[PDB]
Structure formats: C-alpha cells, structure tokens
C-alpha cells in the first residue's frame, strides 16, 4: 500500500518537467519527506512497486543531494533495505559517478549506501544515535590541541597543503617536517602551563562537541556528541569512557591542524602513506590488520574497502573512536597473554603492573596498567621497549577525566 | 530501548529491555513488561545446546541468520495469542528467544524480541 510519503514523492516525480532530473528544490523536498517519514519501509516498498524508486535515484543528480538522499534511505530502512539497495544499483547504469565525489571519492556509491546502512544500525544497537552537544569547539588553527579533537574541523575538509610545502615535505625539509608533525617535545612542560581548569576545559571541549562525521544523514537527527560515542564504545569493549578519553586527549594535545592535513593528505596521495589519523591517531595499516571497524561495519563491506577508504573513515570521528577503543582492548587482551618475566623493562617502569587484570574492565586495573598501556598505545605493544614520556602524559589526561566535573551520558 | 547488561553463569550475556522486569531462569533470562498492563509483552532468552527443529523459516538478523516460527492461537478480548520462537547459532551452540503478546490487528512484529536476539551472545 502507498504511503503519504510515497504519494508525495510520486506526485513530485510525475509533475517534474524534465524526466532526467528533478530540481534542487524538489530534491530537498523529497529528502525532507524521507527524513520525516514514520513508515520508511512501507514508503520504499511502494516506490519500488510503481517503478518510482529507481527514478528517484536516477533523477537526484548533484552528488551532495544524492549523498543526503541515499544516506537518509539507507539509515531509515530495515526490512526493505535490500529493495532500496537494488534500485540504487539499477540506477547506476546511467550514473556511474553517484556519490563518489569530493570527500567521498574513495567510496563507490553502493559502498556509501552500505556504510550508511551499517552505521545507522550500529548507532541504534550500540546506543549513539542521538546526543545533545555539551561542549563548543576551539577556533585554534596552530599549536597543541588545534587538531579535529579541539576544533571539529574534519581532516578531509582542510585546504590542500600549499604546493611549496607539499614539495618540501616530499624532500624532507626539516623546518617543514616540523611544521606538519607532532607539536610537543617536552610533554611535562606543556602540562605545566595548563591550569586545572584549562585541563578540564580541554577535556569538556573534546568530548562535548558533536562528532565530525562524514555521514551525518545516516543519523536520525543531528550527530551525537563524542561523549555518547565514547560511552557506547566503552560498553562494547569493556573499557570506560574515561580511559578512551584520556588516550584521545593525549593524542589531541600532541596534534595540530597542519598535522591533521598532512595525516590525511599523505594517506590518500600517490604515496598511500601509512600515517596515524584522526582522534585516536590510528595507523592506516593497523586499522586494516586488526579489523578495527568490525563493530560498525559488516564483514563484506569491510573487506571491500580500499586502503584510501579506510584512511577516510579514520577521519570520521565515530569510526575513529570505535577503532581507538577496539585497539585499546586489543592491546589489553594481548598484555594479558604475556609473561612478565620476559618483560623486565616493562616491570621496571611499571612495577605494579598486573597482566591478568587487563582482561577485565579498567575500573579494576592498577594505575600502572593504564601507564603501561599508554606506552604500548603510542609504541609497538609488549616488545619491552617503552615510551619514556607518554605514560605520565596519558596519566595526567586520565586524572582530568576522573575529575568529578566530567560526566558521560 | 535496552539498559543493563545481564550475565548468566552459563555464559549467556544480554541486555535488559527498558521498562521490563528481568528474572534469571535455568538457562537464561525472562523479561516481563513492567507495570500491570492488560496485554504485556513477555520475552525469554536462553542458551540451548540442541539445534532448532529442522526446516524453519530463515531471515537475516544483524550479520548472521536466524531460524524462526510464529504461531497463533485463540486468545481473548485483547486479540489472538501470538508466539515467536527464534534461534541463532553461537559457536557450536544456540541462543533462543521466545516471545509472546496478543493482538487483534494481525501478527505482531516482535521487533523487541528480534533486537534482544540480535544483541545476545555467549562467552
Ligand atoms: Ca600527533
Ligand atoms: Ca599523525
Ligand atoms: Ca613498546
């Protein structure tokens, strides 16, 4: 049976003067109708029965509008999703370009559909489909804490690095390498110049703002807070949002806008660089090797992602937070399988480390577990080679997240 | 939609549906809709060693599949009685959800029961 929404969309398509393309205004009206529909499955069935669903996909032309339409349908449909996907595939004969433009150039149109569909399902299942913002973004453009964690500026949206600087990076000009790398040397000195309130403000800014997502219309309404996504990932991986927050806050203090631009742009350049990207500074090859999107995307979609697509997803905050959390849980589980006798330097640095405790939740870990894991998150894990500075740096971030003024939904 | 995570000594782990009262059973958890409604939903989730009866309908559920059947029988003034029984594999074992409610307006979707099955797991 027709729906109010199917009838409206059919009326608009039937009335449209051109049979190859609806107007931008007509398209925006169809997208709004789809997003406000209380019976999306029935609407999709109706449109597919009349032959109008394929027409809809064929006739909504500019890529930005196609992305909004497709992400909206993918994210709202359940029992009729396959019908929509099929109609979209049928439509692609006459539009090989589809959604595969701008920031989404590494996602084939059906891959875009599948990501949207899987992400919407995961946000509903794991509890991050909606969250009111409780923090506002920084306008910093240089220096420590001027990457996406502070600013909400997606790395994929940053201007192309100036031609002169791209060349210099390729040639390893020392000042330019510096400019586009980690901003901190002396980690303690940096923490020393932040007041206790400055520290809390950074944490609140980080977690309180909306995710910077590449798939906003996959969500029912506005994108959720980072804090919401971190709580969901903590529940999924038997961690705590405080631990996840500490790891990300440390990475983001040691992050700049320019580092974000290099991180992403190098990864999708002809070099396919193996950079650490986004909130948690996840390495491209690690995300692939350890299947770090397992809990947000199904296996067939994941196995089909190109390397540049994976790098692109690491720039979408929710994918990055889940990958970060999954990897923290990987490092902890791996730790639990080690022999402390074969880790004398680790024991020397973290003498109250308890390897078995890692298998359980961080609330029950010795503080030495958190310090050691921080070393083994920045560096290769459990090789008995430690980062001298990262443990204290993460431990201070953790102390901030354990302040009574930090609340997670 | 769901709140607390519940863990059975047999290794079944699941979440409690919001607004339902939970009790532990021999091989899992029983959920009964809260309050004192006329026509409450009732859900049970269990670990089971034996497979489902053969040749049941199949559907996609999350990223695997489930075998299921919905039965109907005479009810009362709130409608016919409907029951879902559905199972999915969990390693060499199975997880089963059964659910019931009445309806006078056709077969219930059992959306809540399907969601509970999807998120259940063994460890
Ligand atoms: Ca960095
Ligand atoms: Ca990096
Ligand atoms: Ca190491």
Curated annotation (Swiss-Prot), chain A:
Ca(2+) 2 binds at residues 376, 379-380, 383, 385. Changing residue 19 to A: Significant loss of membrane-binding affinity. Pfam families: T6SS_Tse3_cat (PF22115), T6SS_Tse3_N (PF22120). It catalyses: Hydrolysis of (1->4)-beta-linkages between N-acetylmuramic acid and N-acetyl-D-glucosamine residues in a peptidoglycan and between N-acetyl-D-glucosamine residues in chitodextrins. Its main location: host cell. It is found in: Host membrane; Secreted. Changing residue 26 to A: Significant loss of membrane-binding affinity. It is an enzyme of class 3 (hydrolase). Gene3D superfamilies: 1.10.530.10. Ca(2+) 1 binds at residues 182, 254-255, 259. Forms a heterotetramer with Tsi3 consisting of two Tse3 dimers and two Tsi3 dimers. Formation of the complex inactivates Tse3 enzymatic activity. This is Peptidoglycan muramidase Tse3. It comes from Pseudomonas aeruginosa (strain ATCC 15692 / DSM 22644 / CIP 104116 / JCM 14847 / LMG 12228 / 1C / PRS 101 / PAO1).
Swiss-Prot record, chain B:
One of its GO terms (molecular function) is metal ion binding. Keywords: Calcium, Lipoprotein, Metal-binding, Palmitate, Signal. Ca(2+) binds at residue 104. Residues 31-63 are annotated as: Disordered. Immunity protein that plays a role in preventing early activation of toxin Tse3. Occupies Tse3 substrate binding site and prevents the substrate from entering. Forms a heterotetramer with Tse3 consisting of two Tse3 dimers and two Tsi3 dimers. Formation of the complex inactivates Tse3 enzymatic activity. This is Immune protein Tsi3. The lineage of its organism: Bacteria, Pseudomonadati, Pseudomonadota, Gammaproteobacteria, Pseudomonadales. The gene is tsi3. The chain holds residues 23 to 145 of 145 of the full protein.
């Amino acid at each position: 049976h027709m729906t109010a929404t199917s009838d409206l969309i059919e009326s608009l398509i039937s009335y449209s003067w051109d049979d190859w393309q609806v107007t931008r205004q007509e398209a925006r009206r169809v997208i709004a109708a789809i997003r406000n529909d209380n019976v999306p499955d029935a609407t999709i069935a109706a449109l597919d029965k009349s032959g109008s669903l394929i027409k809809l996909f064929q006739r909504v032309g500019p890529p930005e509008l196609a992305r909004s339409l497709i992400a909206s349908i993918a994210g709202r449909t359940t029992m009729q999703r396959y019908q929509a996907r099929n109609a979209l595939i049928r439509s692609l004969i006459n539009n090989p370009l589809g959604t595969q433009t701008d920031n989404w150039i590494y996602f084939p149109t059906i891959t875009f559909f599948d990501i949207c569909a899987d992400l919407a399902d995961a946000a509903g299942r794991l509890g991050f489909a909606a969250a009111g913002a409780t923090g506002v973004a920084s306008q910093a453009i240089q220096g420590p804490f001027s990457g996406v964690g502070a600013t909400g500026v997606n790395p994929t949206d940053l201007p192309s690095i100036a031609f002169g600087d791209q060349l210099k990076l390729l040639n390893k000009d020392p000042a330019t390498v510096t400019k586009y790398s980690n901003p901190l040397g002396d980690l303690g000195a940096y923490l020393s110049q932040l007041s206790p309130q400055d520290k809390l403000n950074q944490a609140q800014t980080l977690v309180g703002q909306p995710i910077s997502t590449l798939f906003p219309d996959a969500y029912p309404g506005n994108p959720p807070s980072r804090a919401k996504v971190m709580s969901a990932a903590a529940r999924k991986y038997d961690l705590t949002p405080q631990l996840i927050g500490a790891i990300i806050l440390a990475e983001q203090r040691d992050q700049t806008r320019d580092e974000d631009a290099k991180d992403y742009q190098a990864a999708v350049s002809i070099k396919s660089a193996n950079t650490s990207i986004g909130l948690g500074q996840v390495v491209v090859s690690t995300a692939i090797k350890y299947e770090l999107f397992t809990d947000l995307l199904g296996q067939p979609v994941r196995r089909g992602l190109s390397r540049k697509a994976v790098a692109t997803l690491l720039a979408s905050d929710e994918f990055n937070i889940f990958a970060t959390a999954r990897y923290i849980r990987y490092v902890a589980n791996l730790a639990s399988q080690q022999d402390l006798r074969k880790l004398p330097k680790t024991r020397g640095a973290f003498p109250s480390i308890d390897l078995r405790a890692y298998a359980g939740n961080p609330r029950n870990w010795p503080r030495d577990n958190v310090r050691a894991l921080a070393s083994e998150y920045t560096s290769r894990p459990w090789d008995d080679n430690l980062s001298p500075g990262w443990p204290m740096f993460v431990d201070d971030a953790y102390a901030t997240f354990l302040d009574p003024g930090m609340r997670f939904p | 939609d769901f709140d607390k995570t519940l863990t059975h000594p047999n290794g079944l782990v699941v979440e409690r549906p919001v607004g339902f009262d939970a009790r532990r059973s021999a091989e899992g958890f029983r959920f009964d809709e809260g309050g004192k409604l006329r026509n409450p939903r009732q859900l049970e989730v269990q670990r089971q060693d034996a497979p489902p009866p053969p040749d049941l309908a199949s559907r996609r559920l999350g990223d695997g599949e489930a075998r299921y059947k919905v039965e109907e029988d005479d009810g009362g003034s709130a409608g016919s009685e409907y029951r879902l029984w559905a199972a999915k594999p969990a390693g060499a074992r199975w997880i089963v959800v059964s659910a019931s409610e009445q309806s006078e307006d056709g077969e219930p979707t059992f959306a809540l029961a399907w969601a509970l099955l999807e998120r259940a797991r063994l460890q």
